[PDB]
Amino acid sequence: EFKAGSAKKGATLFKTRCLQCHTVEKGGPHKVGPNLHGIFGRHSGQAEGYSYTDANIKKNVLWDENNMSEYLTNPKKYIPGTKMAFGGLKKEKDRNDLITYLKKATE
Amino acid sequence: EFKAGSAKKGATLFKTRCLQCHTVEKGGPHKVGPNLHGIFGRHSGQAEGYSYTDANIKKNVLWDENNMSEYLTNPKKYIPGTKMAFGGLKKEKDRNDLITYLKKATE
Numbered sequence: 001e002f003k004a005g006s007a008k009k010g011a012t013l014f015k016t017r018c019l020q021c022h023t024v025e026k027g028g029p030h031k032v033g034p035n036l037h038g039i040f041g042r043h044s045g046q047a048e049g050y051s052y053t054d055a056n057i058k059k060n061v062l063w064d065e066n067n068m069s070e071y072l073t074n075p076k077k078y079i080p081g082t083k084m085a086f087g088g089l090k091k092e093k094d095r096n097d098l099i100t101y102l103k104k105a106t107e
Numbered sequence: 108e109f110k111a112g113s114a115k116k117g118a119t120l121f122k123t124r125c126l127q128c129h130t131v132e133k134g135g136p137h138k139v140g141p142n143l144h145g146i147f148g149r150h151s152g153q154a155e156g157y158s159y160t161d162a163n164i165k166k167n168v169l170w171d172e173n174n175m176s177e178y179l180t181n182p183k184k185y186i187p188g189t190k191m192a193f194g195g196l197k198k199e200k201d202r203n204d205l206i207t208y209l210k211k212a213t214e
């Protein structure tokens with residue numbers, strides 16, 4: 001259950017928990033993970049130029065703040081077979097802050 | 108203006124005229140030019156993870172078989188300021204064959 005949080009705290013969390021694998025800006029490069037520009041409102045496995053697992057593509061989830069909060073809690077449970085090596089953001093406050101930043105940064 | 112041609116001949120033309128800068132398959136990499144999967148029915152300058160010119164983004168053309176054929180005839184004339192260093196496919200039969208292949212390969 002998503003609730004708007006602190007984009008400032010979320011930016012700091014993104015720099016330590018996500019930035020190593022993902023960029024957010026339009027035209028930002030794909031790295032270990034896909035560039036996340038426009039992720040909200042895009043179906044999973046649809047960023048062109050990125051080699052996804054069939055698991056991520058087949059899940060075909062339409063990304064929204066609410067299902068992304070469920071996904072980021074435990075990625076392997078959400079998408080069994082995903083190659084995103086991320087254990088999960090277990091604190092609701094952290095997910096709210098990170099997703100608030102992500103929505104602003106990927107717009 | 109587009110008329111269905113030979114996808115077999117189009118595949119060979121893609122190899123000699125496009126492949127040096129582009130891939131077509133789902134998950135294929137961005138190179139000098141963006142990966143072209145899902146190009147038809149998408150607006151120009153929208154493949155994630157690729158850094159386009161402002162010219163290509165501003166053009167905001169919804170790609171279809173006809174405007175693709177005009178574009179490929181003379182890219183710099185259709186999108187002034189584009190960084191696609193391609194003189195153009197001047198032959199109608201070559202554009203028809205290539206687009207017939209692209210319609211299949213990018214979908």
Ligand SMILES: O=C(O)COc1c2cc(S(=O)(=O)O)cc1Cc1cc(S(=O)(=O)O)cc(c1OCC(=O)O)Cc1cc(S(=O)(=O)O)cc(c1OCC(=O)O)Cc1cc(S(=O)(=O)O)cc(c1OCC(=O)O)C2
Pocket residue numbers: 017085086087088089090091
């Ligand atoms: O227990 C649990 O079920 C939950 O564990 C946590 C997770 C997320 C958060 S949280 O978002 O609220 O913060 C907090 C904890 C609890 C915890 C807190 C801290 S600490 O107090 O903050 O120092 C340090 C460690 C922690 O785990 C204690 C333990 O394991 O007993 C020990 C550690 C440190 C580091 S490391 O420093 O980043 O390299 C990495 C891992 C760690 O786990 C080692 C282990 O597995 O063996 C692996 C791991 C990575 C990630 S990431 O990929 O999403 O980053 C998320 C989780 C991870 O655990 C996977 C797993 O549990 O299966 C899930």
Ligand SMILES: O=C(O)COc1c2cc(S(=O)(=O)O)cc1Cc1cc(S(=O)(=O)O)cc(c1OCC(=O)O)Cc1cc(S(=O)(=O)O)cc(c1OCC(=O)O)Cc1cc(S(=O)(=O)O)cc(c1OCC(=O)O)C2
Pocket residue numbers: 198199200201
């Ligand atoms: O056969 C027909 O009845 C009529 O075919 C044409 C001719 C002249 C003109 S035209 O002057 O108005 O242009 C236009 C066409 C129709 C056509 C147009 C275009 S296109 O839309 O304009 O691109 C492309 C091709 C064309 O032929 C479609 C097809 O073959 O089914 C495919 C092609 C491309 C090229 S290429 O320019 O070197 O790349 C070369 C040839 C091609 O044809 C063979 C193939 O591909 O195997 C060989 C050929 C050369 C010459 S030249 O040396 O005397 O000029 C004249 C003709 C030729 O074809 C002879 C042959 O068939 O027997 C006759």
Ligand code: HEC
Pocket residue numbers: 014017018019020021022032033034039043044045046047051052053055056068072081082083084085086089098102
């Ligand atoms: C590298 C070790 C990563 C870290 C750290 C995080 N992500 Fe990731 N992510 C990574 C990969 C390799 C993939 C593709 C997975 C696949 O199975 O193909 C992803 C994917 C995502 C997605 C889905 C993107 C899509 O287009 O469907 C999202 C929404 C995502 N990652 C978000 C994300 C965030 C917010 C992270 C920090 C909290 C994060 N990822 C860390 C690799 C890595």
Ligand code: HEC
Pocket residue numbers: 121124125126127128129139140141146150151152153154158159160162163179188189190191192193196205
């Ligand atoms: C390198 C020398 C290229 C060759 C050869 C071809 N293309 Fe290209 N293409 C290239 C670049 C650098 C760009 C981006 C242009 C920009 O101004 O940002 C492109 C772009 C395209 C596009 C538009 C893609 C979009 O998402 O809007 C298309 C449809 C395209 N290119 C098609 C294409 C084909 C079919 C070619 C062979 C005939 C071809 N390109 C060659 C670089 C290069």
Ligand code: NA
Pocket residue numbers: none
């Ligand atoms: Na742990």
